[PDB]
Design a protein around this ligand. Structure first.
Ligand code: C2G
Ligand code: C2G
Ligand code: CA
Ligand code: CA
Ligand code: CA
Ligand code: CA
Lengths: 332, 341
């Protein structure tokens, strides 16, 4: 058992993006495996480890790990103290003095963590930093979609909307786009592409809201990916069906595109299942991840050429999948 | 560091399915996280825990876990002793005497493990048992991505194990079998394209042959401790390619008669991937073996390929597409609904 002692401050009562800052630091520290104790005057309980936080701070780091006695720092500024259980043998009922004496008999190493010290002025700075802490994204995802999706999640933060609700809703948008494709006209094809790209953007909000409001879940991760598999398939299927009326050859291209869209996903998730680490190719890889796939569909749709999108997704998709098969034979 | 002390026996020099019983017990224990020391007379080194095996034994269990001092037992017979580090404070240079005293000062719980005590007579029995331990089941203690379906377990494994027994004496690697299994699916797919009952019959037969042999790569991997991360990755990926290409070939031929079969083909092809994806995504998210508790539609790969096989011999591959599309998609949707809880 580890205890995190956090001194109360009036600023902790302010809400930032759906939760009070008090709940945020409480939940963040609990994630790290610490029992949290807020205090004005400190009374020490027995525990294996102790975390002491005197100044009000917003922790932005996501996978905090504290093994071994250290001092927590953010840009030269001390955030908190991480002491061992032997701190019990020095504590005398007065906090600063006990810390002072304890620090004098020690020579503690510093440890950098992502956090921002809170003031009544920099709360806007804290929000932007907290939002930026929510973003394995492809280049299109990171540099385009996130810019919009974060602005949306910011607004969704103030609501009771759950990550799962966003996921299903995002899925529904992909259906609207697919439906618009079935109407077989440039206008509807254009509207289709726009909503597909919107779907691409909003599919980041489910994850953003999940991390922002500490509502991540195993089922959430599962459903998020699965419905993306359904969306990719249904989108490609819709585009192929309309095109098949003109040329039956598009069935073949359609098949190859749908398969590729699924395999880029499968190969990645299967890697995680087998290696138990995040998939991330070190060097060159053909940019045909989902953010690219939907942007390609969007772009080709605005010029009334969804068929060209299938060709690219089929080609770049299948080749990248094959590239991954050959590449992964290496380090394993 | 944890030390496993194994008393030497002449029988450990004998080869069982490609590896000596020495190599087998050594690797099994190494997998279990023990530094292994073979001995005639025992000199004790320091470690957190000690495992002592006096009688010659073949361990069949796959994911052995030893927490807390215990006595290891197989069907009433003592296999070995699992002592704590405090055994050092009792050891007097004589193994037999120290075991007696340590057991005297303690009250060890018995602990059942799957293993067979080895004799010069029961080696054929050891072989049969070792082969049966290669199956993806809960009885073996393996915690894989999936367990074997009913068709795989009750039909396919019976053949693939008999094949794996023969492959054990060769230099054939798991990856080589995986590629070969995939190539068979291509031969099956090609036969579908020739569009005749004879070739259609051969296609189905080879698809089921493919289904059976797709168990050999996994069997040989576990049998000779040649499991690998890429191996697990490749085994699954090529199965997806196979599922897609098989359905693709059948759909392409059928489309010449009625273009609507493209749709059924699509739905069948999609399902074949989703049954796989939903499971592996579970593994990725929950980090444990996927296993539905109650009702689930039997449309796993062993069934799908058997369905394709059966439908092909009656010259109705379209029916296989219909069955796979229907059973497959409802099962995928069922998994979406079931996992919410
Ligand atoms: N309803 C949800 C959705 C997501 N997550 C969590 O958020 C992670 C994914 O976050 P995303 O931002 O949605 O990432 P992704 O949608 O895969 O990519 C979208 C992004 O590239 C922009 O298009 C999942 O692993 C899951 O743990 C969750 O818990 N519940
Ligand atoms: N070249 C390979 C292939 C597989 N494996 C390992 O074997 C496991 C799968 O074993 P299989 O028995 O082959 O499982 P499966 O392919 O599902 O066989 C099912 C079969 O009955 C077909 O219906 C993989 O996860 C991997 O750990 C390996 O190490 N190397
Ligand atoms: Ca998402
Ligand atoms: Ca999604
Ligand atoms: Ca296999
Ligand atoms: Ca395979």
């Amino acid at each position: 058992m580890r205890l995190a002692y956090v001194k109360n401050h009036e600023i902790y009562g302010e809400k930032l993006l759906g939760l009070t800052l008090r709940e945020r630091i409480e939940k963040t520290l609990q994630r790290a495996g610490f029992d949290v104790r807020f205090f004005d005057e400190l009374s020490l309980e027995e525990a294996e480890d102790y975390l002491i936080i005197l100044e009000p701070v917003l922790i932005l780091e996501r996978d905090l790990l504290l093994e071994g006695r250290k001092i927590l720092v953010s840009d030269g500024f001390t955030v908190g103290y991480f002491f061992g259980g032997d701190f019990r043998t020095v504590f005398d009922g007065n906090l600063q003095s006990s810390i002072e004496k304890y620090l004098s008999l020690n020579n503690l190493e510093s440890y950098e963590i992502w956090a921002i010290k809170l003031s009544n002025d920099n709360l806007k700075t804290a929000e932007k930093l907290l939002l930026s802490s929510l973003i394995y994204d492809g280049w299109i995802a990171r540099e385009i979609n996130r810019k919009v999706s974060l602005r949306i999640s910011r607004l969704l933060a103030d609501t009771s909307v759950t990550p799962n609700q966003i996921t299903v809703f995002s899925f529904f948008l992909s259906l609207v786009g697919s439906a618009l494709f079935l109407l077989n006209s440039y206008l509807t094809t254009l509207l289709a592409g726009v909503i597909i790209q919107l779907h691409s953007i909003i599919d980041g909000c489910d994850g953003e809201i999940a991390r922002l409001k500490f509502m991540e879940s195993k089922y959430g991760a599962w459903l998020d990916g699965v419905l993306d598999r359904y969306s990719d398939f249904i989108i490609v299927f819709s585009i192929t069906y309309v095109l098949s009326a003109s040329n039956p050859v598009y069935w073949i291209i359609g098949f190859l595109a749908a398969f590729a869209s699924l395999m880029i996903a499968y190969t990645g998730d299967k890697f995680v299942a087998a290696y138990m680490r995040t998939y991330s190719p070190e060097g060159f890889a053909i940019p045909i991840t989902r953010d690219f796939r939907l942007l390609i569909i969007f772009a080709c749709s605005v010029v009334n050429l969804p068929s060209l999108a299938l060709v690219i997704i089929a080609l770049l998709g299948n080749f990248e999948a094959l590239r991954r098969i050959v590449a992964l034979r290496s380090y394993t």
